[PDB]
Design a protein around this ligand. Sequence first.
Ligand SMILES: [Mg+2]
Ligand SMILES: [Mg+2]
Ligand SMILES: [Mg+2]
Ligand SMILES: [Mg+2]
Ligand SMILES: [Mg+2]
Ligand SMILES: [Mg+2]
Ligand SMILES: [Mg+2]
Ligand SMILES: [Mg+2]
Lengths: 98, 83, 129, 23, 129, 82, 71, 208, 218
Amino acid sequence: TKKRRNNGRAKKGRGHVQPIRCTNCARCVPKDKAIKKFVIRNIVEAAAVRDISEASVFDAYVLPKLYVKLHYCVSCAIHSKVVRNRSREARKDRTPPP
Amino acid sequence: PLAKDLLHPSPEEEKRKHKKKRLVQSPNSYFMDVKCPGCYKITTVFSHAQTVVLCVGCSTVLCQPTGGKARLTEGCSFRRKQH
Amino acid sequence: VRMNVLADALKSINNAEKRGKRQVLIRPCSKVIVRFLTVMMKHGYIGEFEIIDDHRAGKIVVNLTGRLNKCGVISPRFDVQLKDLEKWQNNLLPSRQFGFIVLTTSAGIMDHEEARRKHTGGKILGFFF
Amino acid sequence: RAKWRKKRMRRLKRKRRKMRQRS
Amino acid sequence: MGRVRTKTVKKAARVIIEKYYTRLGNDFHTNKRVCEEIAIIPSKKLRNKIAGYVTHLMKRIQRGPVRGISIKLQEEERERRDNYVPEVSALDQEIIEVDPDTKEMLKLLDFGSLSNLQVTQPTVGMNFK
Amino acid sequence: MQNDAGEFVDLYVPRKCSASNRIIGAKDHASIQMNVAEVDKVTGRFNGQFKTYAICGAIRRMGESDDSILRLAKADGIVSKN
Amino acid sequence: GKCRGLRTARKLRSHRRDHKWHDKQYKKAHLGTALKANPFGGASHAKGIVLEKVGVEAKQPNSAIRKCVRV
Amino acid sequence: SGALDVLQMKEEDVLKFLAAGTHLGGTNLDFQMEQYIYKRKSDGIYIINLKRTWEKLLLAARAIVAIENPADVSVISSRNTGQRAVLKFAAATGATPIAGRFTPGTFTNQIQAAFREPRLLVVTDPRADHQPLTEASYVNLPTIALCNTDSPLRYVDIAIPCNNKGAHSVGLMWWMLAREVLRMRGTISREHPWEVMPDLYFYRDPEE
Amino acid sequence: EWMPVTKLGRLVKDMKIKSLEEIYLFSLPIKESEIIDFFLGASLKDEVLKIMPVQKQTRAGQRTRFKAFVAIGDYNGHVGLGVKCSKEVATAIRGAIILAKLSIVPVRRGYWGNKIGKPHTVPCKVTGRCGSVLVRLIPAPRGTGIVSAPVPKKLLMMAGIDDCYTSARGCTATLGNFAKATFDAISKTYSYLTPDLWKETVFTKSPYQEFTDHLVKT
RNA sequence: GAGGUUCGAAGACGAUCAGAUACCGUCGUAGUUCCGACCAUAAACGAUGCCGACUGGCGAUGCGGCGGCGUUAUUCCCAUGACCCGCCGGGCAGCUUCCGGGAAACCAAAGUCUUUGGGUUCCGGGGGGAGUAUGGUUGCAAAGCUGAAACUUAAAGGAAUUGACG
Ligand SMILES: [Mg+2]
Ligand SMILES: [Mg+2]
Ligand SMILES: [Mg+2]
Ligand SMILES: [Mg+2]
Ligand SMILES: [Mg+2]
Ligand SMILES: [Mg+2]
Ligand SMILES: [Mg+2]
Ligand SMILES: [Mg+2]
C-alpha cells in the first residue's frame, strides 16, 4: 500500500544521497527526506526590541537576525508539531499555506 | 484528433517536426555560396560545417564550426536558394 | 527491435480504430504489409490506403472506417496443413459467420476462404474480423 | 524480527560446524 | 447561549414575512398578535417566540435586502432595474482599442472598418514564477 | 440478418454513430441525436427539413463531438469553407 | 514473458519439465518418498495385527476420545 | 450556417464583437479549441476567428430551431454574468432558464420538484456550470456551450468560441443566439435590426 | 393505476410507442418499472438468484441487511438483473425486481453457421466481466442446450438463448459477479459490430420528437 | 599494512525500573580515518527485467540544438553573454481524465490480454518444516553460492469496509 507515490523522500533519478543527522533527536535522515524549516528569528524578540532601542548607544539601528536552517527528522517533526497528519485526498496538496 | 489529413500536411507543421519524423524524411540543412570581403571568389560552404572552411585564396578563414550551424567570420554573405 | 513488421503495423491500426481515429500511418512498411492490407480492403475491413515512398523503407497511410474490431498477428508463422485450418478458425475468430485468417500460400497472400477454394495450406500471418 | 532470526541460524549452524568437526 | 432559534421558528418566521411584508412592522407586541390572526400557533411560547425573527428580519431588511429572501417589493424592484439600459450597450462610440493581429483577423474576413492599431512594449508575458 | 428466406430477423437494427460508424448502445445514455435544420436558401427561415446526426458516448467523453459535428456538417453543405 | 519462438520446442519442453518439481501433487507421485514412506506400500489396503487399543484425544474445538488401534 | 450568401457576417455585427472583446480569448489554450483560433499576440492572449465564432453560432441556432417545442431547451448559467442574459434569450425564444445553482438532478429524479427532460442544453461556461453537462450524460442531451480558449469539451454537441469572461462579451452571444433563433423562423425580417438592444443582456455590478 | 411523471412514461401508457425496440433504438433511460410492465405484460417470469446477508459493524452488534439478486426475462429476447439491498428479505426481493425490470436489455441472437430457421445462439463470442470474474459466450449448434454453470444458465435460458458453451473464470463462487459479469456478456451481443449490420443507418425521428405534440398534452 | 579527529558494537560505571545484563546518563576497545588483499550481500527499493512497437491532455525543468520579438547590459555596433517568447530532439520529474487498464489500492503507463501469441532473458505454483538437513563448491571465516524430504498444517495472505482501541 504505497502511501506516498513519492515515498516521503524526494529522490527520483539517483541512489544513495547525502544523509543528515537531525537537530533534535540527532537521528540520521536523507537530505531529500526530512522537514527543513529555516527560521529567520530576530535576536532581541518582540518584547526587548524597545528596551534595547532605548539603551542603544547608536541611533535607530536595524538589529541582526539568526539564520538557522532547522532540519528535523520526521519523528521529531511530527512529535514537535511541525507538520501534522492529513486525510487521503489532502496528503497530496503540496502547497505551503499561511 | 479524429481527422488529421496526414498525407497533405500544411507546410508549417513539417518544419516544427524532427527531420526523420516528417512524412518524408528530408534534412534541415543547407549549403550557402559565400562571398567574404577581400577575394571575390565564392566557396560552397555547408552550414553545418564540422571543419574550418578556408578561403580558396588563402589568408582569411570563413567558418569557425560550433554545435549546430557554422559561425561565419565577421562580415561575409551567403546564398541558400536552390534545389 | 523490429522483429516482425506486421505486429508493429497491425497493433497501430487496431490501436487507432479503438480511439476512432480517422486514419493512421505505419512507419516501417513492407510488401507483406501491402499484400495483407489489400486483403482487408476487399471484405471492407479498411478503406483505401496510400503508400508514401520515402526512398528507404516506405510509409503507408490507411483510411480506416469504423468497421475493424481488431486485427492481430500470429507470431510465429505456423504452418497450417488444411485439416488444421478449421481448428484454427474455430479458436481464432468470433464466429463461423465472418472473420478472416489472412495467410500465405503457394498461390499468394489471401484469406482462409480463398485458400480453401483453391485447396492449399500455408503459413498463418494474422487475422482481422 | 527477520534480521534477528537469520542471525539466530547463522549463529546456530556455526555451532553444528563446531560440533561436527570434532568428529 | 440559552437561545438560538429552532427551525420550526426560523422557517415559519421567514414564511410569514414572505407572505405579509405589508402587515408587519418593526415593533414586537403589534406583529406579536398579527401572528395569532394569520397562523394557528398552538403554544404561547412559540406564538410569542416566532415574532422573534419577524422583528430580527425587519431590522435586517431596512438596512439591506437578504441575498436569499421572499419579498414582493424586491421582485418588483428587480424588474425595474433590468428594464433600464443604455441606448446601445456595445456601440462604444467610434474607435475600438484593437491589436494589429486583431486587425489581421478582419482582413481574412475582408471587412473594412475604421480603427488605428497600436502594438508596443517588450513581450514580457504573464506572471512571475 | 436474413437466412434462407431473406427473412429479416433481430428485433431491431441499432443506430450507429455518424462520426465513428460504431454501434450505439441500447443503454448508452451519453448518446445524442442532434437534429439540425436547413433554411429556405434565399431569406433564412427554417422551413423544410432536417440534418439528423448521431454521436456515441465514447466520442463525447473523449472531448471531440464538436470536432466531429463540424466535419460532418460541412460535408453535408450546412457549414462551408471557413 | 514466455519464449514464443518457432525453434523453441525444447526451451519450452525443458521449461515445463522442471517447473513441475515445484508442483506438490507430482512430487508425491513421481519422486520416490511416497512409496518409501507410506506403510501402505502404494497399496490400497493392508493387513496387520492388532497390538493394542488406544484412545486418541480429538483436536481442541471438539472434545472426545476416538477409539483406535495400534496396528 | 456556413453562410453561403444571405445570413453572412455583415459589418454592424462585427463592430459589436470587437467592441465587447468577444474575440480576445484567455492566455491559455485547451487544444480542442485550436480549430477556432488564428494567433496569440504578444502578452499571450489568443484571438478567436470571428468567422468560425459565428458559423458555430448559427450551428447552435439551426439546432435550437430544430427543436419543435421551444420551451424544451434548458438554458443554464451558474456564473452571474449569464444570469441576466439567459433569462432574456429564454424570454425572447420561450425556452426554459436555470440561473445560479444547477440544482441536483433536474435531469435525473422523478421526485424532486424540478426535473425536466429537456432536449438541448445551452451553457455559459462548460468550466463552471459543469454538473448539467455531466447529468446530460445520463439523459440523451445534446449540449451547446459558450466556450473560451481555456475550456474543456467533455460533453458538448457544439462549442461557440468566445470570451465568456467579461460580462460585456457574454451578453452579446446570448443576444446573437436569441437573435438568430428568432430570425430563423420566428418574427424578424433579416433586413431590419431589432427593437431589442444589447444593453438588456450583460449584467450590472452594484451601480446606484 | 399510473401517474407517469416521465415523458417517456406518458408516451407509453397512451398506446403511443408501439414496441420498446423504439426506446432501445434511441438509448433512452427507462425509469419506471411499470413501463416494462406495459410492454411485457405476462411473459417476464422472475427468478431469485440469491439472498446473501451482508452486515456492517457498529458499537452495538452488527447491522445485518439482506442483498437480493433477481433475474428477469421472457425466454425471448429481453432479460435483466436486479440487485437490491435492504433490511428485510421481502423488501429486497420486491424492490430488486423493480430494478431488474428497469435494467432489462435485448439480446441479439445469431446463428451456428448454416443460416436456416430461427436464431438459437449468440452471434459472436462475446465476453463480459465484473471485477475479476469473466464469462465468455461461444456460439452453439442446435440441440446442444446451454453448457455452463447453474447461474449463467438461469440468465441465458431467460434471454432466449437456446444454445451456448461458455468459458468462465475468476472467483466464480461470488454469485453476484457470477451474474453481473454475465449480465454484461448478454448486453454486449447488441454491441457486436458485424458485416450483417454495416449498412449506414436510415435514421428516424425519435419518440420525444414525433409525438412532441402529445407531450404538450391535449 | 598506515592513523588514532569525533562517534562508537563490545566493554566500565550513574541512574530508571519490581528488573534493565535495555532504553536515559558518564567513560571507551574493535571499527569508523588511510593504503594493500579478500567477502559478495540490502527494504542492494521505482519492492516495476531488457530491447521493440502503438494509444490522451496539460502544465514545469536539466542538456543540446534550432527559430523568434524582447530588452538589462555592453561598447559605436557587435560577438556575446545575461533575461523574454516559441519550436525541435532525446533527460530527470509533475499534475489530470470514465483511453484503457487495473482484486484492489493504483498505473501514460501496471495501457494494446478469452478481441489470448513483437523478441527474448529470469522466475512463482497454499503455509511451515526451511532457505533447514544432506551433498557439492568458493572462502583464511562470517559465511557465500547450489539446495531436498518426513511431518504437519487449514487456511496463511493481499487489496480495499464498517467497527473498536491508540
Ligand atoms: Mg540504494
Ligand atoms: Mg580432544
Ligand atoms: Mg587494520
Ligand atoms: Mg550511551
Ligand atoms: Mg538477494
Ligand atoms: Mg503485471
Ligand atoms: Mg497471454
Ligand atoms: Mg509451497
